[PDB]
Amino acid sequence: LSVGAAAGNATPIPGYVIQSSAQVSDDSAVSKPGFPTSGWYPVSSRSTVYAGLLQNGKYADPFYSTNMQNVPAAQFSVPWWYRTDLNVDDTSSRTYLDFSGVLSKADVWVNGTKVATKDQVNGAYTRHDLDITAQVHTGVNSVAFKVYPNDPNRDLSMGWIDWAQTPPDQNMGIVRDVLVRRSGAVALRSAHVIQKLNSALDHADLTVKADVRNDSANAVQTTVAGTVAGKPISQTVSLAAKERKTVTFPLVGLDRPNVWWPAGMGGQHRYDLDLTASVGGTPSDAAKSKFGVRDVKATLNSSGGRQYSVNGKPLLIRGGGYTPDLFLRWNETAAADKLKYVLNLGLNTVRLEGHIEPDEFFDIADDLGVLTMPGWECCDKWEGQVNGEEKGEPWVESDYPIAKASMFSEAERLRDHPSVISFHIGSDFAPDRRIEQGYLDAMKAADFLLPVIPAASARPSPITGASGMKMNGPYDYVPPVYWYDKSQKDRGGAWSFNSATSAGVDIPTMDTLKRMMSASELDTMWKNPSAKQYHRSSSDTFGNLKLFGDALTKRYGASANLNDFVRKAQLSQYENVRAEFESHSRNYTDSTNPSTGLIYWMLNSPWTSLHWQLFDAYMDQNGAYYGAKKANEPLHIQYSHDNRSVVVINQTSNAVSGLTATTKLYNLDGTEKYSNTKTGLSVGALGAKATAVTVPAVSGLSTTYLAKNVLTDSSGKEVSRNVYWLSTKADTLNWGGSDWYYTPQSAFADLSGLNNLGQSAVGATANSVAGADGTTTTTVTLKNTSGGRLPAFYVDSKVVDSAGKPVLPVEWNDNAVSLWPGETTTLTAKYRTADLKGSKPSVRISGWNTGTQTVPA
Numbered sequence: 024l025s026v027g028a029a030a031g032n033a034t035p036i037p038g039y040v041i042q043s044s045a046q047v048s049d050d051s052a053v054s055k056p057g058f059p060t061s062g063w064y065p066v067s068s069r070s071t072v073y074a075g076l077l078q079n080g081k082y083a084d085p086f087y088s089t090n091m092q093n094v095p096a097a098q099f100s101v102p103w104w105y106r107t108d109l110n111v112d113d114t115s116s117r118t119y120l121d122f123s124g125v126l127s128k129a130d131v132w133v134n135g136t137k138v139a140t141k142d143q144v145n146g147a148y149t150r151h152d153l154d155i156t157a158q159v160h161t162g163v164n165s166v167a168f169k170v171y172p173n174d175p176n177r178d179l180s181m182g183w184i185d186w187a188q189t190p191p192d193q194n195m196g197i198v199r200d201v202l203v204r205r206s207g208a209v210a211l212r213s214a215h216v217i218q219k220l221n222s223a224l225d226h227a228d229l230t231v232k233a234d235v236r237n238d239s240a241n242a243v244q245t246t247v248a249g250t251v252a253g254k255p256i257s258q259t260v261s262l263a264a265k266e267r268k269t270v271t272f273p274l275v276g277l278d279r280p281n282v283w284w285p286a287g288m289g290g291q292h293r294y295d296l297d298l299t300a301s302v303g304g305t306p307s308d309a310a311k312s313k314f315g316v317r318d319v320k321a322t323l324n325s326s327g328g329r330q331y332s333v334n335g336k337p338l339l340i341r342g343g344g345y346t347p348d349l350f351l352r353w354n355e356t357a358a359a360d361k362l363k364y365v366l367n368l369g370l371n372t373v374r375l376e377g378h379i380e381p382d383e384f385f386d387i388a389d390d391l392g393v394l395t396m397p398g399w400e401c402c403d404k405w406e407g408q409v410n411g412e413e414k415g416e417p418w419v420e421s422d423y424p425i426a427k428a429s430m431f432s433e434a435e436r437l438r439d440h441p442s443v444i445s446f447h448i449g450s451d452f453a454p455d456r457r458i459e460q461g462y463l464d465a466m467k468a469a470d471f472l473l474p475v476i477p478a479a480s481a482r483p484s485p486i487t488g489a490s491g492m493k494m495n496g497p498y499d500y501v502p503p504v505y506w507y508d509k510s511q512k513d514r515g516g517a518w519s520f521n522s523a524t525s526a527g528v529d530i531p532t533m534d535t536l537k538r539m540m541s542a543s544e545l546d547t548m549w550k551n552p553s554a555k556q557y558h559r560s561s562s563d564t565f566g567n568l569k570l571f572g573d574a575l576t577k578r579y580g581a582s583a584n585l586n587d588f589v590r591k592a593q594l595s596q597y598e599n600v601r602a603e604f605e606s607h608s609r610n611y612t613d614s615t616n617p618s619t620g621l622i623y624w625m626l627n628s629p630w631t632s633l634h635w636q637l638f639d640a641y642m643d644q645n646g647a648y649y650g651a652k653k654a655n656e657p658l659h660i661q662y663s664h665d666n667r668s669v670v671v672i673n674q675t676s677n678a679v680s681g682l683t684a685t686t687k688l689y690n691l692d693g694t695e696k697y698s699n700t701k702t703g704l705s706v707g708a709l710g711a712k713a714t715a716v717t718v719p720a721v722s723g724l725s726t727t728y729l730a731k732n733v734l735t736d737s738s739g740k741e742v743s744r745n746v747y748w749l750s751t752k753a754d755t756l757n758w759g760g761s762d763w764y765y766t767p768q769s770a771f772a773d774l775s776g777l778n779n780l781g782q783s784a785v786g787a788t789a790n791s792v793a794g795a796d797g798t799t800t801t802t803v804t805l806k807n808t809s810g811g812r813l814p815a816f817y818v819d820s821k822v823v824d825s826a827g828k829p830v831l832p833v834e835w836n837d838n839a840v841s842l843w844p845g846e847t848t849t850l851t852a853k854y855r856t857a858d859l860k861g862s863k864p865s866v867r868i869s870g871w872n873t874g875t876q877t878v879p880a
């Protein structure tokens with residue numbers, strides 16, 4: 024690792040060699056050039072200690088079975104050393120280390136000199152700008168961090184609450200870049216752009232602000248100059264030695280701006296800011312950044328619910344809680360792939376309960392137009408001052424400055440990313456008056472002007488007041504019809520802002536299960552859902568799958584084997600997830616106590632998991648994935664579980680007309696028991712609704728029966744198809760036996776008729792085209808080819824290689840389809856050609872009642 028004396032440079036350290044402090048008797052030696060590093064582990068940038076060890080193949084894959092449990096934890100109760108060499112070609116310019124992402128705290132050493140202590144460098148989110156000119160010399164230099172162990176209850180850091188299992192190193196390390204910075208007498212820092220757009224959206228007057236710091240021994244004059252959005256800006260100011268000033272540039276108008284819009288509402292353009300700070304007529308430093316022209320409000324409506332709007336357009340928030348990799352392994356591509364999945368799912372937002380991702384994540388979200396909901400996390404140090412019996416230690420005087428500094432640093436990162444619609448200063452508990460003032464003050468200081476939400480629960484903060492959100496559960500199984508209830512003010516019904524709720528277990532696809540659990544573990548899974556699974560939660564509330572398994576047995580029938588359990592798990596996850604979203608969609612436009620947002624719990628998992636996920640750790644797509652995708656289609660037909668209303672949802676930003684909504688009922692022997700065609704439907708923009716018909720109570724329906732919704736646009740084209748499997752027996756709730764994380768059932772619906780649905784057939788043809796942009800698009804055509812009256816039900820197509828393994832990540836236009844005899848559908852799958860790994864592409868088609876076939880592609 025080198026540096027160029029050219030003033031402006033901000034090169035990240037590309038790697039380190041790491042080792043336990045157990046191996047080091049003389050702290051000061053580690054940073055002296057030529058210190059012997061034999062037996063040290065080389066790790067890439069942004070590594071936890073444990074991620075660093077795995078990179079070196081020192082332990083088995085923790086995604087598989089109980090591998091993570093065989094890792095001795097004790098070795099991570101002492102500090103570890105992160106160490107690298109640093110070539111300096113010319114110490115003409117000053118040298119800085121600028122960084123964050125240290126868990127939990129660190130000593131910083133340069134060339135035998137301790138330049139900062141763990142007291143000065145403390146907290147994952149705190150930024151640090153260390154002037155190390157005094158210690159740097161020409162040639163080979165050395166920098167070493169003594170990173171201290173991490174405890175999320177004690178440290179203003181990251182913890183994993185109850186999502187998965189505790190990583191053995193408890194995430195200790197450096198999980199962001201350490202930047203080596205070079206500049207002259209004057210350092211440029213904190214350059215940003217306050218932007219205020221008018222309500223006609225055709226003018227913005229922009230305010231550029233940036234700090235300059237004179238780290239030389241004498242007074243200087245410095246000119247700060249460059250462009251913002253195609254406009255010259257320039258300011259000259261004076262500076263004493265060691266002095267820092269905030270330069271505020273004069274206002275700049277931008278007549279007709281390229282407004283930034285969420286996915287599906289317009290472009291995702293960003294403008295540039297580009298400043299050079301100069302001394303004696305020479306660049307001393309320089310900073311390039313981006314920003315979006317976009318307004319965002321989150322106001323409380325008349326029923327007391329939080330309501331987002333972007334560029335004056337109100338939106339129902341539809342998304343899921345986002346989590347990074349359990350050992351915080353970063354990969355830019357993987358981050359874009361995940362955000363791209365949000366758009367495949369048709370969601371508009373992700374929430375980050377702490378674990379706030381590096382800058383690139385937000386760059387991508389900005390470009391994709393995916394909205395982000397960052398904030399602090401519950402259930403550990405962050406709320407330890409205000410959460411009573413909940414895990415997390417009470418604050419001491421020294422916690423407050425770190426807390427505030429953390430807020431300032433994150434606000435400083437987030438402020439100019441248009442995808443950000445708010446920061447959450449609380450999650451389960453809102454902070455007290457002291458801590459909230461610190462948080463609000465840090466925001467003002469950074470010019471963070473985005474909505475501030477006191478909590479994701481219902482608890483209000485002293486100063487910002489009501490949240491307009493709720494966290495009543497559930498997080499484990501409830502019947503689909505639960506989601507439709509507005510009568511229980513203490514429950515997770517579709518009203519207000521559901522900031523974190525799901526129905527628990529989300530069994531991943533077979534291809535995934537086999538990679539994550541041994542045959543014996545999988546055997547136990549279906550036979551005894553009541554037993555602990557290492558790949559659910561470390562929490563006792565969610566250590567097992569009892570609640571899911573009783574429900575799955577009683578509703579769909581007892582399980583014969585693994586395949587039976589799994590295919591039943593997928594229909595239940597498809598059924599539940601769909602209902603959860605479709606209910607919130609419908610109740611959006613309700614006059615009184617409407618639904619304002621829904622954050623599914625969760626969008627993804629930190630590792631290979633059995634719950635709280637839409638996509639799994641390998642990017643694979645199951646029942647719950649398909650269920651949300653269906654529920655969130657842009658032009659969509661649904662059916663209400665509470666009252667049989669056939670509703671139509673238009674998520675797009677244009678009103679739409681000439682819509683025909685064909686709705687049919689069938690028994691399990693294929694006999695049509697009802698039919699409706701509503702023609703000339705007109706549904707307005709951005710999640711407006713129209714009823715097509717309320718299905719009447721029909722007699723002679725089989726115990727288990729189907730519903731077939733079809734929606735076509737005025738040019739023909741089938742735009743939405745939605746198939747329900749229902750029961751003349753109803754799911755009912757024993758509301759009185761409710762606990763915080765679910766509501767128990769008194770009655771169960773009977774969908775076991777599905778066990779006996781007669782065989783059908785499909786009916787498949789596929790071919791592929793590889794683009795010059797290194798993607799492949801595979802086109803499959805499905806047909807119900809049988810001569811009966813039975814549908815080809817829950818047909819699932821997967822791009823696979825010759826090994827029959829799924830090509831991932833992948834994005835379908837539609838999947839898990841149901842076709843009545845003679846009907847046809849054409850599907851599109853897009854994926855990177857390289858993920859095929861030289862193999863020829865194939866498609867694996869599997870139905871509930873059509874068996875499995877794979878056709879070439």
Ligand SMILES: N[C@@H]1[C@@H](O)[C@H](O[C@@H]2O[C@H](CO)[C@@H](O)[C@H](O)[C@H]2N)[C@@H](CO)O[C@H]1O
Pocket residue numbers: 184185186376401402413450451480494495496498523763
């Ligand atoms: N200890 C619970 C707390 O976990 C819960 O809030 C959410 O719970 C999810 C499931 O436990 C969890 O994954 C998420 O991180 C939490 N924000 C609250 C409120 O429902 O109650 C506490 O008793």
